[PDB]
């Protein structure tokens, strides 16, 4: 009937469900006279009475995992009284993206290798996000369409969290994904670039991917476990999961960095994601769309671009199922001398300098990105092989680095 709305210790509101349907948001008096207020998301401004927008549907539509496959596992694990956000969120709303706890401070339970394997292995049972029957207290929810789940790690410990206890690590399954990803965030942080760090965890015979989370934050003696307020691009603008893609209608290059004007630190995140769309153009990532880049909402309601993830290669994926180098598109296109430059085959410096222009960003920054990855790129990719386990998967490492030097070459003749 109705959520209440908590981030940390402090209670910011509460989502009702309406007769009608619709899905309600009013802030709570107190939260809005509190010290360093601010919204839960740029899309709900702090604002006395009842928010009925659609932006409000769905702002909490884009904390539940994508997939309407695993909203349907959703809805069966827990009998949710249906297939809307507030009553799936009733249900798995504890644990969320950002610092967005749901209910209608510190406690778990440590896992055993065969626990967590269990865990790990879930979903081959039709289970939602790794939370087996077994437990009736992990309540938790990310999204994203991967397969996946979260986890608590105190020590060199897994735990399941309990109650609003937060986690730590968002984990992926294999739906040669995880080798993948691990692969191209080593590549990432190697380049300088503001990346997670994640470490490939074994349990029995499962490969899985454990990426830390930047929007939890232990205090400076490690004895409590905070959670930080963060939102992506579709929830900033106030836009639906189902439209994230340019092409769908969600936000290109152009919108973010307009938007990234309103950054307490807007010539770095400028800076910062201009040089991520040479990344991922690098290493052929085709889907940079809006929930793959967020914003921390801090005291006050300023914001900052938070560090980039869900890095994958399509590089690996090529000829394989007749994919070829030639189907790749960025998700979000460049300028082009007429319209849009998407394919990945096709793009060169010429395009970045285009659409730096237009958008008002110093042309001498943008030389600097493309001058530096000419000369950076060789070295980063022997680094990185160097600091692989000799078990990881040989095809990914030589489809990614001769692809990239590839590209890589574009630049060394340039620059
Ligand atoms: N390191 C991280 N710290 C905090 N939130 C993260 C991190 N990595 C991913 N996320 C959040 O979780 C979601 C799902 O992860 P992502 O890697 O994008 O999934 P898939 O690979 O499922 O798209 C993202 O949309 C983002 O909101
Ligand atoms: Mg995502």
Redesign the pocket.
């Known amino acids: 009937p109705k959520l209440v709305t908590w981030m940390n210790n402090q209670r910011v509101g509460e989502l009702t469900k309406l007769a009608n349907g619709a899905h309600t948001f009013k802030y709570a008096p107190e939260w809005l006279a509190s010290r360093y207020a601010r919204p839960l998301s740029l899309s709900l401004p702090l604002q006395r009475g009842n928010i009925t927008s659609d932006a409000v549907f769905n702002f909490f539509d884009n904390l539940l995992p994508?997939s309407p496959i695993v909203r349907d596992r959703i809805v069966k694990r827990y009998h949710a009284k249906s297939r809307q956000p507030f009553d799936l969120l009733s249900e798995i709303g504890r644990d969320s993206?950002?610092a967005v706890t749901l209910i209608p401070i510190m406690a778990w339970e440590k896992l055993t290798e065969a626990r967590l394997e269990e865990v790990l292995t879930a979903y081959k049972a039709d289970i939602p996000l790794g939370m087996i029957r077994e437990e009736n207290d992990f309540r938790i929810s990310?999204?994203?369409?991967?397969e996946?789940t979260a986890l608590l790690r105190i020590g060199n410990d897994w735990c399941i969290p309990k109650g609003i206890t937060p986690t730590t690590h968002?984990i992926?399954l294999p739906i040669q994904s995880v080798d993948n990803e691990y692969y191209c965030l080593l590549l990432a942080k190697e380049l300088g670039l503001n990346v997670?760090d994640a470490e490939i965890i074994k349990a029995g015979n499962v490969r899985a991917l454990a990426?830390?989370?930047?929007?939890?934050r232990w205090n400076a003696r490690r004895t409590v476990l905070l959670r930080l307020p963060?939102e992506?691009m579709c929830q900033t603008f106030g836009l639906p999961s189902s439209v994230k893609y340019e092409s769908d209608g969600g936000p290109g290059i152009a919108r973010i960095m307009a938007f990234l004007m309103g950054s307490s630190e807007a010539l770095k995140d400028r800076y910062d994601f201009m040089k991520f769309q040479v990344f991922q153009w690098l290493i052929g990532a085709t889907?940079g769309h809006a929930?793959?880049f967020?914003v921390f909402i801090q005291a006050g309601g300023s914001y900052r671009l938070?560090?980039f993830?869900?890095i994958?290669s399509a590089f690996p994926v090529l000829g394989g199922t007749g994919i070829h180098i030639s189907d790749l598109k960025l998700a979000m296109g460049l300028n082009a001398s007429k319209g849009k430059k998407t394919a990945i085959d096709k793009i060169y410096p010429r395009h970045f300098l285009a659409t730096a222009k237009v958008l008002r960003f110093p042309e001498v920054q943008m030389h600097e990105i493309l001058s530096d990855f000419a000369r950076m790129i060789p070295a980063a990719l022997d680094n990185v092989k160097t600091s692989l386990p000799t078990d990881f998967p040989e095809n990914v490492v030589t489809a990614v680095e001769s692809n990239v030097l590839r590209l890589h070459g574009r630049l060394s003749r340039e620059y």
């Open positions: 994508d993206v950002g990310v999204a994203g369409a991967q996946k968002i992926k997670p990426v830390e989370r930047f929007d939890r963060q992506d889907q929930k793959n967020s938070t560090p993830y869900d994958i």
